[PDB]
Amino acid sequence: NATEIRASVGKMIDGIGRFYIQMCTELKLSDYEGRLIQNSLTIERMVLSAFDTGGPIYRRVDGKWRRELILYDKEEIRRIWRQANNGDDATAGLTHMMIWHSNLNDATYQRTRALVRTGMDPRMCSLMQGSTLPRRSGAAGAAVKGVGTMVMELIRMIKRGIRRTRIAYERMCNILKGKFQTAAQRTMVDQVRESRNPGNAEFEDLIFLARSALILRGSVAHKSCLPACVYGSAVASGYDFEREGYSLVGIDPFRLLQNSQVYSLIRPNENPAHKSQLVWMACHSAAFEDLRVSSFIRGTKVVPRGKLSTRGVQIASNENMETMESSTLELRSRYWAIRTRSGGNTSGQISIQPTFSVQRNLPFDRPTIMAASDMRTEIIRLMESARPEDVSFQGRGVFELSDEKATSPIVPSFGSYFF
Amino acid sequence: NATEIRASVGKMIDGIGRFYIQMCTELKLSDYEGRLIQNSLTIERMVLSAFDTGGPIYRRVDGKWRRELILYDKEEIRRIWRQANNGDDATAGLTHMMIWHSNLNDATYQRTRALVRTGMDPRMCSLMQGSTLPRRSGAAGAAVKGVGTMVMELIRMIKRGIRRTRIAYERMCNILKGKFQTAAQRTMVDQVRESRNPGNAEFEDLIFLARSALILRGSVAHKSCLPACVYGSAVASGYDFEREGYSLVGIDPFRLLQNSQVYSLIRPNENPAHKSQLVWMACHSAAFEDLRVSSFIRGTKVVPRGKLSTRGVQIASNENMETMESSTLELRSRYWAIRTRSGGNTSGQISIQPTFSVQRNLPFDRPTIMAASDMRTEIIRLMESARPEDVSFQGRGVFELSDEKATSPIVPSFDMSNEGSYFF
Amino acid sequence: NATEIRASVGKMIDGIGRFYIQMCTELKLSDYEGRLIQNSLTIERMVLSAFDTGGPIYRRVDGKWRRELILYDKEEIRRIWRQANNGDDATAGLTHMMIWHSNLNDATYQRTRALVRTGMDPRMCSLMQGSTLPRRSGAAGAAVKGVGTMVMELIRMIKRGIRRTRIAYERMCNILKGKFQTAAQRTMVDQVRESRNPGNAEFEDLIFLARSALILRGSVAHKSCLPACVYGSAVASGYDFEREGYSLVGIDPFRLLQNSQVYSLIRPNENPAHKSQLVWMACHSAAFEDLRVSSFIRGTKVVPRGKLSTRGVQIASNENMETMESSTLELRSRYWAIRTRSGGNTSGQISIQPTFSVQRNLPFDRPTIMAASDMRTEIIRLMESARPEDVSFQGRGVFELSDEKATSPIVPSFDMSNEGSYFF
Amino acid sequence: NATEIRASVGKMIDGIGRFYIQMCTELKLSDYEGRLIQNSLTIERMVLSAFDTGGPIYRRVDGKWRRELILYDKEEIRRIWRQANNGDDATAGLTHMMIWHSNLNDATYQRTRALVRTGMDPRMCSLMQGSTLPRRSGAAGAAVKGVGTMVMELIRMIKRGINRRTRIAYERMCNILKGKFQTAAQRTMVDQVRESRNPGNAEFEDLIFLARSALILRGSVAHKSCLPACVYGSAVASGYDFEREGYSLVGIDPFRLLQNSQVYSLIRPNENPAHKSQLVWMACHSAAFEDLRVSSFIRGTKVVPRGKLSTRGVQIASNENMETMESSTLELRSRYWAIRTRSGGNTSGQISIQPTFSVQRNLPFDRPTIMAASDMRTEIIRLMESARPEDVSFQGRGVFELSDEKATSPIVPSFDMGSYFF
Ligand SMILES: Cc1onc(-c2ccccc2)c1C(=O)N1CCN(c2ccc([N+](=O)[O-])cc2Cl)CC1
């Protein structure tokens, strides 16, 4: 069954790939051009639009980068998609690209103005993964949406509050409950769900739950979804994604990025290694991850959004094509890591006992040892019980790329906020 | 004409694949056994023997490998060849296999002892491409034979000066002449050929030309030819070779190896990666290629022959089976490159005039600027002029395995350290 | 006399500037018409014929452009020039405009016919700076000339020879001698100069000397000489050149261009960006400069002459003005850099003594050791000594346009894909 | 016998080490202070002087570096030396330290002023390894001296000739020099210089000529990794058995020993530490006139020319200010190790390539070997033209991983990471 998953995940990939090759045949792009992320993005944005068309395609002519603006029938694209997915409409593949896009968004744009607009805390952006994704996304879509995104969506509904949209509010309530780990938080979601007239109090509870999820974090899916051009390149190399299988959370995407080759258009003022960092973060869904953890896995320093030289991957219609040069996106990384759904809630040893007289801190597991009527106060009780020093994922590490089955972990010894 | 040569090579490869599949049925071989390079080798060796029989076939019982010799009527194997080839005799396909064998040989053994035996330098082995291959290889075989191989065959005929076979000597001289790129070298062959009774005079001219081929290199074809089991696997999978076409010199063999599965028997001391280096090199006619270039294409390091722990792919009759392990060969590569006939030999600006005080190198096309009666000493003059640091194949590059039409050349550099340059 | 060269340079620039303005008023040219490079060229071309008339002048009338072939008195323009320069002949100003035209030519035309007519290698176009420049140019004009230009002038004489024209030959031999950076090249020009009977040997020695100038590069002045409209537009804007000073190799021409406004007529098949690449290079004496370097200084890429879509700045009299349009030339750049006179030549240890048993070449300085003799062989050896990879102008880099004094250099780190640096 | 060598080389090391520990006990230096190269150098310079005394010893007191100036009887030191070398005078050990010193000199000082003084070419400094070594050095001393050093020494004698037992002294030095040359021709030329009964100006010219030839047709010259005594003393104090383990000057041992060692240097305020590190490291592996590209490779950081270094030189002058003197770690580790050779590398198996792939690159061949298609001066000249700076020597030799104890898998570099230290 783990082998079953890998087979249909792999067929999903094989499809996107096969599609992409067909778009590089139509458009008569060279292998270089097909590997331009900007081109990749337009092709992805075309097929997504086709199932809801065109956009900028970039050719290299006389050593310079030419933007053209192509158009196509949604009907032809929708057929090519089916052809490449072997008859099927294959909605998983569409969703995959949607998640890659959102991951790119989460890493490109700070969603602050949209947060105050909803009467939420502008500093909550770590909870916001998946915010630019549509509500017309799959089970996989909801998996990927962060607690914040969920809370914002339910607030939008309550704010519009002052039939069929009752289930829409209850289902989203459910999804949100499904994200919480603690008994208490889960019960609070029920009280908000069960409310027949969702007033201001319901709003406050959501704002309160949102805030709680900064400390008592939510279980949120992380998937490595790469630009279509990556997959198309792999398929064109003869790679059998169905027969080999593939996983979004394992080694596969890291392994695939080691030997891949993507190029980006880069604005004169911009620093390439930075445009590389942006894209890399998007690829492994790591915009609200520990910058220290990112830097470790990558093997160069991942630096905050305010330190980047990059104006953002996609290129504006009014921008000048004359100053536009391009370069390699450097997408390899020293190690790989499994990605988890969990936020990591806090037998085997809890403490140390010093053997050697040597300057150092002396570890112990503070939560586990420190285990020596309103829902709001119970949640408050736990948040004080937590300190930013508590270790989660005890006994988990990164791996050598040579470590195909993940047998020998590597734990690092280390602000660290991207935004 | 190009779209139909593909169609016919397609047809040829197809037959090998079909024949191999047929032999795998004939011999009731497991999926794993049919892909074992050693089994492939015997199957190939048998068809060639039947068209001038049996050989060893390896089977895993109880986990441990068991070899058993097998005998087949030469007439019966000939029948299977012709069936898998829709009736036609498919000599091209028998030649393809012969070349694969010749490529494997080139990569496995130094051709030193037979070199001193003829009158030639042991340090001429970079010129011995296809010295294992017979004269029973056609025009395809002639192309693949290197400058020194030719030279050796003419010296063997001369040293049998101790009619209808005169014209054989002429034809061979023409092939040899056809490989030289300087006219000076060609005029000298046109001074060996017409010599009606050749003895020491012509043998001295040939050694000189052979020696000259080390610097002013001849044009020798390189063809990627894979072991029959790979083609068999690709046929079994539903790749119609005849319809899709196939090139020996383009992406097709590289793409075929990326996605194939070939196993090999390994002796207890041997390193599987090193064995995988031997097969890879063989597949791509790369025995006498700059190791630095091989490595770059391959994506991992390609090391010299005397740093390799391999006795050779073949298993000799006396070998201990009980101690024999097997493993998957690493035949993949990071990039690909067109295989060439070329030897490399060499208006508008040829240099730069610095306008600005800016730190940089000042490029200039060195070999051209540097380019500025007896035929022997004419060659020497050109030889003295040649510098090993001069670049050839200007603008030609490697390609991504997705780059079918060779659109986007990647021009490498070899700063990523290696283990030599000469494989010998 | 540090700032004193700068004041007299700004004297000439004010000069040309005042002359352009006064000439616009007298041709009654609108401000847009006035800043047109084609009106600039004809106005420039008129003073120079006058001190040795007409040419086409262009107007926007009824929305489109109309050429009018106007004729003014040589004697009257000669008078206008004088009172623009406060009485003086001030021939320095005249030389300036000649150099500007030469740099445009140098960017515009491949001198391939011109080179072969002379029995020179057509591949010598890099050595050709100031080929269209007359002998009637100053010592300013002599400095700007390339090694190959000088060799050509000398070959034309020796050829014309198959009194006081002898002192002419000898003068040119000395001009050339001073461009040479090595003592061997210098001595060899002196053997040419001292020749009792200038014939074939001297032709052969010059050809050899030109060839050596490709690797062992001559020293050639690069001066940034801009169109007269550019200077006239700053002097129209009350900018005081005699006050502020001016350099031809300093920041000032880059500074002037960033603030400047220059238009050009563009044919409907012509790319505006390509026309403006050409003018830009001519503005900075940059025809034979490494494209990598030119590109880095400008920001936007500088392509080879064969990828450009322009047939020149001047318009042929048979060309139709109805389909003719015009736009603003991109004369700006991302950075600025100093212009050298030098062509970058590349005590203490002269050899290595190996410590480690490691595979490598064992460097030694072959010219210097072997120098312990015929002049050709001394030169060949120094040429063989040089590699295209050798770095020149160590420590020297480009500056931010704000950075007015040369305080903080930017040393560029140049691409792995490094071929195609030659504009012709 | 290879095992025999390692045993007595090892005993030699063990001795220096044991001696050094005894000097750190007397002087009551802390483990830190004993690992100061400057202290190491004074201790070494003391025992060398004793057998021909004192000098500056640096203590760390209240966080600052104090120079004192100690004195001792040559008699006491000479006894400590014998005690540590277990009765023996053990002259090998003395010579070892002398070579480390010369190696340090060859990397510190350019010997140019001393070259013109001898009427030799000021650009010959690559031939000058061992020049500051005394003529009172062993067989090991002579091994280590470069052709130039030898030529300079014979010129000094000829120059004194125009102003008995010094006849053998001139002939033996002649012999040593002949022993360094590889080519038949160069060896014969040395004989003509030896056999001359009245060594005039012509003899001088021949030596000058031979010296110059040895820039291209290089001399066989020994390279030995001789480390500061403190390195050894530290190893011996760690309980390490140099006799039982054995040791080699040209193999992995010195690289292996520097990987886990720890030396500190006093560093002048203006100076860059990583540079002082480079100086010492070069000295340690005898690599002052080696290919800077080769050095940089083996080390794993860039080794940069003598004119790019921030360093004023290891030993500290009496008049220098102790107040601005800070100190740091000498970083002496290296990415790889390499065998050191005696040879200069004179130019079966393949001589050329045959391109398989259409790819931009140079196409190698072995120029000398292929180009093999009555005065001694002209014969030598014939060969120097026959040579080009591109000729590869040491075909099929490489560096090794430190993990590669027996040297089984080589690594050949491709050079782009001049290349002359001076
Ligand atoms: C092109 C290309 O497109 N897809 C791949 C690829 C795709 C999935 C997994 C691995 C490689 C790929 C590729 O270039 N490689 C990487 C180099 N490569 C390789 C991969 C793995 C190993 N290895 O870890 O033993 C050794 C090698 Cl030489 C062959 C496949």
Residue numbers in the entry:
A (entry chain D): 21 to 72, 92 to 201, 213 to 396, 403 to 428, 438 to 479, 485 to 489
B (entry chain C), C (entry chain F): 21 to 72, 92 to 201, 213 to 396, 403 to 428, 438 to 489
D (entry chain A): 21 to 72, 92 to 202, 213 to 396, 403 to 428, 438 to 481, 485 to 489
From the paper:
In total, the genome of influenza A virus encodes eleven proteins, i.e. haemagglutinin (HA), neuraminidase (NA), nucleoprotein (NP), matrix protein (M1 and M2), non-structure proteins (NS1 and NS2) and polymerase (PA, PB1, PB1- F2 and PB2). Among them, NP is regarded as an attractive target due to its highly conservative and multifunctional nature during virus life cycle. Interestingly, Kao et al. identified NP as an anti-influenza drug target using advanced chemical genetics approach, and reported that a novel small molecule named nucleozin could target this protein. NP forms large aggregates in the presence of nucleozin, and is restrained from nuclear accumulation, which in turn results in cessation of virus replication.
